[PDB]
Design a binder for this molecule. Sequence first.
Ligand SMILES: *[C@@H]1O[C@H](CO)[C@@H](O[C@@H]2O[C@H](CO)[C@@H](O[C@@H]3O[C@H](CO)[C@@H](O)[C@H](O)[C@@H]3O)[C@H](O)[C@H]2NC(C)=O)[C@H](O)[C@H]1NC(C)=O
Ligand SMILES: *[C@@H]1O[C@H](CO)[C@@H](O[C@@H]2O[C@H](CO)[C@@H](O)[C@H](O)[C@H]2NC(C)=O)[C@H](O)[C@H]1NC(C)=O
Lengths: 99, 593
Amino acid sequence: NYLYRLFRKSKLKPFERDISTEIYQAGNKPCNGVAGPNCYSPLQSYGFRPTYGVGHQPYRVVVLSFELLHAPATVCGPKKSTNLVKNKCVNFNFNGLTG
Amino acid sequence: LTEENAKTFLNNFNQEAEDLSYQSSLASWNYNTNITEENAQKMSEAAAKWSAFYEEQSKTAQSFSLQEIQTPIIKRQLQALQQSGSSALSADKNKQLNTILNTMSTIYSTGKVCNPKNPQECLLLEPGLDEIMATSTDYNSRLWAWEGWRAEVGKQLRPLYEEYVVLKNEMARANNYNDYGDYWRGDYEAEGADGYNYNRNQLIEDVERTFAEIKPLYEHLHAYVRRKLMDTYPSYISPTGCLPAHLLGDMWGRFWTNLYPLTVPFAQKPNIDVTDAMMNQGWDAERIFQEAEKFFVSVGLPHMTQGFWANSMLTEPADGRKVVCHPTAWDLGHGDFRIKMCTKVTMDNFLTAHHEMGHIQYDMAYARQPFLLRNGANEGFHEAVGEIMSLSAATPKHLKSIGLLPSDFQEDSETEINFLLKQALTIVGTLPFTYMLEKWRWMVFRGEIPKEQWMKKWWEMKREIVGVVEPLPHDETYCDPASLFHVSNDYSFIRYYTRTIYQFQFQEALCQAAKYNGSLHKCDISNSTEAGQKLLKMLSLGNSEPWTKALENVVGARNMDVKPLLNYFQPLFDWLKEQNRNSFVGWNTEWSP
Ligand SMILES: *[C@@H]1O[C@H](CO)[C@@H](O[C@@H]2O[C@H](CO)[C@@H](O[C@@H]3O[C@H](CO)[C@@H](O)[C@H](O)[C@@H]3O)[C@H](O)[C@H]2NC(C)=O)[C@H](O)[C@H]1NC(C)=O
Ligand SMILES: *[C@@H]1O[C@H](CO)[C@@H](O[C@@H]2O[C@H](CO)[C@@H](O)[C@H](O)[C@H]2NC(C)=O)[C@H](O)[C@H]1NC(C)=O
């Protein structure tokens, strides 16, 4: 159930996806949409098995891409509660207002 | 364009092939470790699917024409894929040849020779006759065993060989080869850049050239063995004559290793055996493989995989599953490397573990290469790489370094001499038998030997080359070669000769790389990373490049050289020359008692 694209006419652009299952035409003759000699289905199967070598074992990959745009940035890290001390002269930082 | 089409075809093939080959290899492993009917049938279906896919791809691959392919790696991959082998013939001829092969295999497996006047004592070759050849000293019993197995096997197998030669000749001609001998010699053919070109015809002359250099050392060894056997057998062996066929310690005379107690130089001096030391220190098979791994990392080759430790069997399971005793190294595919060996805590198993680990390291190095090129450069190279590790492992320096042998051990000349003689009996002795057998098979396939004069030629060559005479005259109704396992089961035999030459050449090259300043036989390649890199350059290549290039990569030469073999055996050669001065070195062709 895990597949990869082995054959494509042109290289992918960054952050592009191709879901096409069209038969890859490597030869002058038209494929006609039926698999035939010199015509190969692009999507091949990753036949994962538990006894494979470490190079071939399945690995799950998550790629995190961070982008900044002219719009106000709305994804930011945690904010520290710290603690509140009263009745003393303490440097206060309340929601970005300092003193 | 044709080259691009071949590249896409190979890319599709490697992904489909690797998966199917892994399924076949895994089913074969499951049968080998856990012998049963269901694992056998599963192996049968897996092999059937893999073979059907491989033939279908080979038929598609034959459409491509090699003339318009410029890149050597794609051309070599297509060459490997396009070898039809036995599929070239028609179905009727292929079925007849398969029937002949199957009946030959079963008849050899079930071969029976039985005691005259003692009917109940009927003996198979594998349980008891080999024991008689290895251990018995009685002349009459050996003469009986040799003659009886020769008579039964030769009389039954002579017609089968007669049509076997014709069918193999038809298959080879169908595959654009001159004869079946040329088809076997194709495996050493290398097509490549200028000066690396090797031809099938060249191989025979190269073997003969190597043989001439090997011949004085073999003649001295034969004379010494003949004198010692004469001491053992007082009147049945002549000083100037050839050795009898049944006194060589083996059924066929293939290995002289069983003659070592009779032919020991120094009886008083013990062997270098370290089994008792392993017993005292509580070593086990896991420790043996770990020490082999330590040697491989120390020389600079990579560590063993986690899968190798997890999945392999290094001990008899003893849980009710039958196993094959023989040690085998398996490259299942997809980075899965395993060893099946029922390892007992002995020195021989320790050396065998080093040999099989060498096979696994050789398999691991060329995993980067494409699927069709994940093989040895030739048949000899794969065995040779394991053999050099076996040679290095057995040295006294290696045993002292790892604590198997005591630190205060003294290496006198006498132990070196008897060890070298044992190595010669195992290694030097097999070479004339191998050369003579391969030459006979090549000439029979060629038709140089007439059909009705086969036996008369073979004994003559054994008289000329091996220097071993028949005990009793054999007419042409006999088929004396066919008693050997390799010939009856359609196996090439020149690989052992090439293995023997390559093993010493590789060992000298690594020792020069490691800057060892002493005798070649005492050399150890441990803790020499440069030697490991020098070896690994050949190991990474596989058969992507011509074997001559790989040979140049290790030894700096493009052809077989037996000067390392003479250099390894030089103290023994000097000793044999020293003790043969009174005696006559050489044999007389005519039959002498
Ligand atoms: C290849 O290199 C390794 C690592 O240098 C060598 O192992 C080393 O062998 C020496 C001599 O046997 C060891 O020295 C002695 O070890 C004993 C036991 O620990 C100790 O009691 C002595 O005082 C002395 O240190 C050394 O420890 C050992 N090193 C390691 C890491 O095992 C190996 O011998 C080399 N092989 C060859 C063929 O040169
Ligand atoms: C040896 O092989 C047998 C059969 O090939 C294995 O027995 C099977 O084990 C699986 C897993 O538990 C069961 O699902 C099957 O029903 C069993 N078959 C039979 C006929 O009993 C056995 O487990 C194997 N042993 C080892 C050590 O691999």
